Write a protein that binds this ligand. Structure first.
Ligand SMILES: *[C@@H]1O[C@H](CO[C@H]2O[C@@H](C)[C@@H](O)[C@@H](O)[C@@H]2O)[C@@H](O[C@@H]2O[C@H](CO)[C@@H](O[C@@H]3O[C@H](CO[C@H]4O[C@H](CO)[C@@H](O)[C@H](O)[C@@H]4O[C@@H]4O[C@H](CO)[C@@H](O)[C@H](O)[C@H]4NC(C)=O)[C@@H](O)[C@H](O[C@H]4O[C@H](CO)[C@@H](O)[C@H](O)[C@@H]4O[C@@H]4O[C@H](CO)[C@@H](O)[C@H](O)[C@H]4NC(C)=O)[C@@H]3O)[C@H](O)[C@H]2NC(C)=O)[C@H](O)[C@H]1NC(C)=O
Lengths: 209, 99, 264
């Protein structure tokens, strides 16, 4: 039986108007007996025809893969409209539907907290700058780091998880050279959220010290 | 976002054979602004074709009127050919006098 | 009542030999103004070419729209996000009863609203990072915001009220539509009834279908401009082939005292 997965747009794409937020409908386990996959897309139960399908790519496990990408209006996604991908194929009785959406609920602004390396952690190759983001709803959020403006490569960020008050929390750690932190470079945790003014949240920058 | 053109082809006055008139090709609801529009008589493109200003509607989508002075017959056919980044092939819409 | 709206468009990469920036100006549904960055001059369109108009009017329009041309093109510099850009503005006014005008100032990047101008405060606002960027670039300029305040709160309400005096006529224009109601075969046992309205103004028009006097509905509509400022509409309803003569088309229009019933 062929499997359908439906992915939401990257949060950053939905918070910047000059980026393309796209939903992504994916079919695996399509038999060579009969490909011929056919997509149907609905925004709030209404069909649209702007979707683009790539050609089916063969996988090394001798099945097929087929992806269909629909661009969404920034404000449709934020107003919480539903995106329904419906896949047709002669390896199923009837088609299968999957629906994806932004979550409904009163949006809450992130509370941001930055932390420098503790002094008792400073004869090591590199040092971590910690970033704690919580009190936000919904869970769509973008988190990156920058020094004196310029973006940064080395950072890991936890998935948003629900807290005991119905808001979401996560953490991000930037690893940096002990020298770059000692040379008094300025580091910032850049957070983007729906409920933030211009979608850009205020955080306090870190600099030793 | 990108939006595919809607294409309407209609005459300025009711189509009476032998009588001077205006053929219009209306292209609306499209984005971005770059678009190509040719009016076709018996399959070949017409030369003396004017057009209105690239303008846009409340939803920000662009629109444009192409038109030519002409005298329709009983056997002559007219169409409108449109290319736009959202179309992988030129789209022909043939003039129907009914509308 | 009636409105004066500038429709402005700048693209960061225009096609070869096409304006990077152009504007159409509208009094209700009629274009009175055309401007583009190639020509550099604001020009009247249609009957507004005949307007009993003051001698400097069209250089006030050129002056104001050159400022905006330069601003719109400055906006792209504030972005530096590689991929190409379209910036649109909907700017103007409509009169509110008792010597008052209600203003409009919206902006779209790549075809979506992202920014506005607040006439109460004198700032560019929006919910979007790219709104902050352009807003901020437009605020570090030679009196950009004061020019925008002036353009909307003084100039638009005057221009509008002066067109009501001098161009009253172009807008009270009433041309009722020429009508056709025709039948074509579609799928076997079925016909397309098509009701056509030709060269009418103003553009507000209601077409619907009757069957032996009874409401048969509005059909599927459609609507478009002509090259001469008139409009065009068709509505189609599928009927039983052999039932066609039981149907007639009712148009309603500002141009007609009483609704007009069209036979096949
Ligand atoms: C033949 O080969 C095929 C190709 O697979 C290959 O993968 C590559 C990467 C390599 O590893 C090689 O091994 C292969 O060549 C096989 O296809 C795969 O089949 C499996 C099983 O069906 C699919 O597994 C699912 O994966 C999703 C997450 O996938 C994302 O992340 C992957 C990287 O980690 C990546 O491979 C995927 O492509 C996909 O990437 C995303 O892509 C989009 C755009 O295209 C991006 O925008 C995203 O950013 C990107 N994401 C990331 C991250 O990178 C996973 O969600 C599925 O789990 C669901 O179902 C489980 C059971 O129900 C459950 O455990 C999960 O919780 C989840 O279920 C949902 O969970 C939420 C909880 O929050 C609930 O709310 C939902 O209700 C619930 N729903 C359901 C129904 O329960 C699952 O693990 C895999 O995606 C697919 N790979 C590709 C590629 O298409 C094929 O199976 C194989 N056959 C055989 C017999 O070998």
């Amino acid at each position: 039986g062929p499997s359908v997965f439906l992915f939401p747009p990257k949060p950053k794409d939905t918070l910047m108007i000059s980026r393309t937020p796209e939903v992504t409908c994916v079919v695996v386990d399509v038999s060579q007996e009969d490909p011929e996959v056919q997509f149907n897309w609905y925004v709030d139960g209404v069909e649209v025809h702007n979707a683009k399908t790539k050609p089916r790519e063969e996988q090394f496990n001798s099945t097929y893969r087929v992806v269909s990408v629909l661009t969404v209006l920034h404000q449709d996604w934020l107003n919480g409209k539903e995106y329904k991908c419906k896949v047709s194929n002669k390896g199923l009785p009837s088609s299968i539907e999957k629906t994806i959406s932004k979550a409904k609920g009163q949006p809450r602004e992130p509370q941001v907290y930055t932390f420098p390396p503790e002094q008792e952690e400073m004869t090591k190759n590199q040092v971590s700058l910690r970033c704690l983001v919580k009190g936000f709803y919904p869970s769509d959020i973008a988190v990156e780091w920058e020094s004196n403006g310029q973006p940064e490569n080395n950072y890991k960020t936890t998935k948003p998880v629900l807290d005991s008050d119905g808001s979401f929390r996560l953490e991000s750690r930037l690893t940096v050279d002990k020298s770059r932190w000692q040379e008094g470079n300025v580091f910032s945790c850049s957070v983007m959220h729906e409920a933030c003014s211009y979608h850009l949240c205020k955080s306090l920058s870190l600099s030793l010290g | 976002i990108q939006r595919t053109p809607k294409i309407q082809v209609y005459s300025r006055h009711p189509a009476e054979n032998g009588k001077s008139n205006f053929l219009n090709c209306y292209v609306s609801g499209f984005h971005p602004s770059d678009i190509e529009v040719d009016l076709l008589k018996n399959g070949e493109r017409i030369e003396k074709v004017e057009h209105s200003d690239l303008s846009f509607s409340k939803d920000w989508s662009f629109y444009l009127l192409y038109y030519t002075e002409f005298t329709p017959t009983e056997k002559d056919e007219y169409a409108c050919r449109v290319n736009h980044v959202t179309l992988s092939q030129p789209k022909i819409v043939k003039w129907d006098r009914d509308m | 009542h009636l409105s004066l709206l500038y429709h402005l468009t700048a693209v960061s990469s225009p096609a070869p030999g096409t304006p990077a920036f152009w504007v159409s100006g509208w009094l209700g549904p009629q274009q009175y103004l055309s401007y583009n960055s190639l020509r550099g001059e604001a020009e009247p369109c249609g009957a507004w070419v005949w307007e009993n108009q003051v001698s400097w009017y069209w250089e006030k329009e050129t002056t104001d729209l050159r400022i905006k041309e330069k601003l719109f093109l400055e906006a792209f510099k504030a972005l530096g996000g590689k991929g190409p850009y379209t910036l649109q503005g909907l700017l103007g006014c409509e009169l509110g009863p008792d010597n008052t005008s209600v203003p409009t100032a919206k902006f779209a990047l790549n075809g979506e609203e992202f920014m506005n101008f607040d006439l109460k405060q004198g700032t560019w606002g929006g919910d979007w990072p790219e709104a902050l960027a352009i807003s901020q670039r437009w605020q570090q300029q030679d009196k950009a915001a004061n020019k925008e305040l002036t353009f909307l709160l003084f100039s638009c309400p005057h221009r509008l009220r002066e067109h009501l005096e001098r161009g009253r006529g172009n807008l009270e224009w009433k041309e009722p539509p020429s009508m056709r109601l025709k039948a074509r075969p579609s799928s076997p046992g079925f016909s397309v009834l098509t009701c056509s309205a030709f060269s009418f103004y103003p553009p507000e028009l209601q077409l619907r279908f009757l069957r032996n006097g009874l409401a048969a509905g509005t059909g599927q509509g459609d609507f478009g401009p002509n090259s001469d400022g008139s409009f065009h509409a068709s509505s189609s309803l599928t009927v039983k082939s052999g039932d066609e003569h039981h149907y007639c088309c009712i148009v309603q229009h500002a141009g007609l005292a009483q609704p007009l019933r069209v036979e096949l």
